[PDB]
Design a protein around this nucleic acid. Sequence first.
RNA 1: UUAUAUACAACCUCAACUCAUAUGGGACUACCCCCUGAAUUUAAGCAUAUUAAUUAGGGGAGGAAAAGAAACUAACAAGGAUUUUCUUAGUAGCGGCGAGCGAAAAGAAAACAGUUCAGCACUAAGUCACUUUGUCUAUAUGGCAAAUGUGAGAUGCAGUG
RNA 2: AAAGCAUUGUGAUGGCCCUAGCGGGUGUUGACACAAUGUGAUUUCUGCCCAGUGCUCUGAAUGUCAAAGUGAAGAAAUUC
RNA 3: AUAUUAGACCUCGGUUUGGUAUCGUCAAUGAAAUACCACUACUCUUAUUGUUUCCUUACUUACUUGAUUAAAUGGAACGU
Lengths: 56, 203, 192, 217
Amino acid sequence: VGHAPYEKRTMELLKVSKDKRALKFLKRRLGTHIRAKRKREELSNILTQLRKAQTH
Amino acid sequence: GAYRYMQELYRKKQSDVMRYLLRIRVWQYRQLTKLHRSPRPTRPDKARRLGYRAKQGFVIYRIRVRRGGRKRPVPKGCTYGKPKSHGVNQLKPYRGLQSIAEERVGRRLGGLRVLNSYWIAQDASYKYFEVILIDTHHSAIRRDPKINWICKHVHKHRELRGLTSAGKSSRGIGKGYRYSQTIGGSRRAAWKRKNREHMHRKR
Amino acid sequence: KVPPPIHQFSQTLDKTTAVKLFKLLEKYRPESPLAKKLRLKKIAEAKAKGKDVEPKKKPSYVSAGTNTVTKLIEQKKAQLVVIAHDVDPLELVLFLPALCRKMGVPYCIVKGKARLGRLVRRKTCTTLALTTVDNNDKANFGKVLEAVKTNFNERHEEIRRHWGGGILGSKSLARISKLERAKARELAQKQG
Amino acid sequence: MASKVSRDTLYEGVNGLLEASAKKKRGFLETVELQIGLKNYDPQKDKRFSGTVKLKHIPRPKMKVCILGDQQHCDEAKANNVDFMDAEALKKLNKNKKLVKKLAKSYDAFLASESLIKQIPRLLGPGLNKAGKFPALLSHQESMIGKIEEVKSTIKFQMKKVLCLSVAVGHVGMKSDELAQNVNLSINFLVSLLKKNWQNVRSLHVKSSMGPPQRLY
RNA sequence: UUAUAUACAACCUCAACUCAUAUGGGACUACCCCCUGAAUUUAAGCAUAUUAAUUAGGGGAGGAAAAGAAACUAACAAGGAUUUUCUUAGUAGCGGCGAGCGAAAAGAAAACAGUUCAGCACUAAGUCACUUUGUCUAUAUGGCAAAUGUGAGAUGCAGUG
RNA sequence: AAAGCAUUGUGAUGGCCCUAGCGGGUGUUGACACAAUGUGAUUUCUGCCCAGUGCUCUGAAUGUCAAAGUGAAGAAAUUC
RNA sequence: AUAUUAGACCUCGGUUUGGUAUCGUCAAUGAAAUACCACUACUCUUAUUGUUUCCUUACUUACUUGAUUAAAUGGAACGU
């Protein structure tokens, strides 16, 4: 299935710019601080996991 | 089994596989009637777990309802009263669109009981629902003792009385504290109690 | 534009190798109406005469339904999994061809949910498995398996990526196919 | 873009690095590098954390250190390969030198001792405030636990201006199992030695000189 | 088959019938459930408030109905579905903080009854409705069996849970 | 009231009006029409005033300036 | 140090031994003393996938509208 827009709109805000803005944009799409923190830690877990298996 | 994948697949409603599936299923079901028979349940994972079985006669009907608040039907010679009374265009029903959905099916089909209802699509002016409905005088709904409760007479038009799962939520029924004042039942059972004025014999 | 889980179906196992699929799956039809309980009147001699375990003689046939075949692949008891392209809504099949790859089971998609239903003696069958491999006919099962695997299992890296649908059609492509006639010919007849 | 005598597009398993007994064609052994990069952390101000990759192993490092002492260094160290300089041959190092055709700054890092705070702040102005070879008593060596093992593979970081450090992480005179031994020790020690740090780093790219840089996950 | 030129099939979505069988509207008003919703009044004026989450209007049932076996309390030495009475209590709160309004836990009673699904490695559709034929014994939308005849059912029926 | 006179809007995905909502009237209409108003047959004329108010103008763009969006500070609420 | 090379080693190149080689790692003299060697940066150039008071053009499949008793629409073809 892949991601929704607001996951892909914040995966690109997680590779570069302002992890504090990956938690203002996720606290508007969810929107609580406890669910934003739980999703920013699981998009940034398959950001790094696909940083493994995109090559090999 | 398959039935557990369908539960998660259908949670991905903002995806791309499951956006261009209930894209093509809101411009089929809106090129037909307001109220419509269905040969299947279109989501047979949510149909069961609401009560549907694949037994004759369990029956599914689609509706659509019109997605907004309630314009107050005052005559454009609008509401005469004190200024708290003047609201027309920003008021909301107390029953939801799903509540009112299976209400509109229970009337038009008086020979069948409404069990439960379920969202299948929506876009901007019409949410629409399947409704699991049951032919209660069938010789297989009545002879089979699991479903057999709704063949009784306290289940005549339950969906018009707040007794299906959708009509139930409008009422405000729970435990404990937050759900306090409908505490005898209804909400009006509770005003009757809380305002009940017992003169006693021995008093 | 169709998102590339759709379509896998419709890359559905073109005719000359899916004709020998049902040449094989004609031997593992589940039941026959009289022959199910003709076998259960061959249990009546076990009531008084046989006095042993003679009439079972372990079965081997296909497994229908989609909730059954999901737990033939999650245990890897399944050796060949047939799916159906024309399933509605889609979701009772949409998880399946990715899971036959994640569990490594050679899957195929055939044309027909009525095609499979008429071999399980019912209306529409939606998907199947094959837990059995029975030894006398593993040869023609053999080169079915890899011939199924090339376009379904080894292709699961662009099947995950490439699908468009997206046809323009049919007087709209015919309108601009006059424009690519003329815009080309304006600088193809540019010399005079 | 990157040679694959050490694989990097094929990502790394621990089972593949022990093939590297057949890595080296060369007999002579020079340095492979500690290369740390402190971005998001500016060290030019007082922002400074002081740790060392404390190796329990000896990957054979190729160099020399001259040290100090005024009744403070070698009352214990004459069984510890030492000289006990009387600590004021340091203007032997500041604009005087050891000899012609080898410099006095030709060492690893220097010794902030106990009697020589008389000498530190500006008298090392054109000697060691100029040079950059001077740590403090943060050195993890004042002849206390690791004197020769300071010279032999335990040395800390005093940082580059453009944040590109090059000192010894190890060498190419390792065994076939020592490639998974140096970073195997910092799986607990430098995970929070980075001060005030959730994870402000990712660049862990151990450079070799006789090969491509070993890049880590 | 499908130059839409011979059939053939099977599904799927939908039709039609003075087809077989059935089901539903309407009444009552005291109580009951779902809705919609005022103004007189009081505030010594009056708009929020009050009246009132009420009169009136609409719909749906039963001899009761609704509710109901915890996404509940508490902060204990802990209690344990629902509903009714007593007390909490005209209290906490709410309010042009004005007029006014206003519950609940605990405690004491009456009564007490508990459960079922969906979703798993149930591990041979193991289920159901018709119809006909034997054949029971209400004037039986019954009882059993046979044909397992025709269908529902693998887009998931039973049992376990 | 009228006939005459004048002004206004409208070329239709329009003007005007109804409608709770769907939808309708004018409309079996189409500027010599439909709709909105003032004056009141003919004759003779209908002066000056756009300061106030109303109506109006692609048009004046930055004095004002909504929610949404965007940026920053903070552990967040949130404030700028 | 490597490069190179013949011999010990290897089936051989190759390793090794030694010779030769560019500033140098070091001197001079300072604000870094720079061999043998890398994790790279700002003016820019590429090449693959990125907030917006973004911007213009184009498409059809949502949707809107008209017309028809839903009859000849879009392409080619010969014959002139």
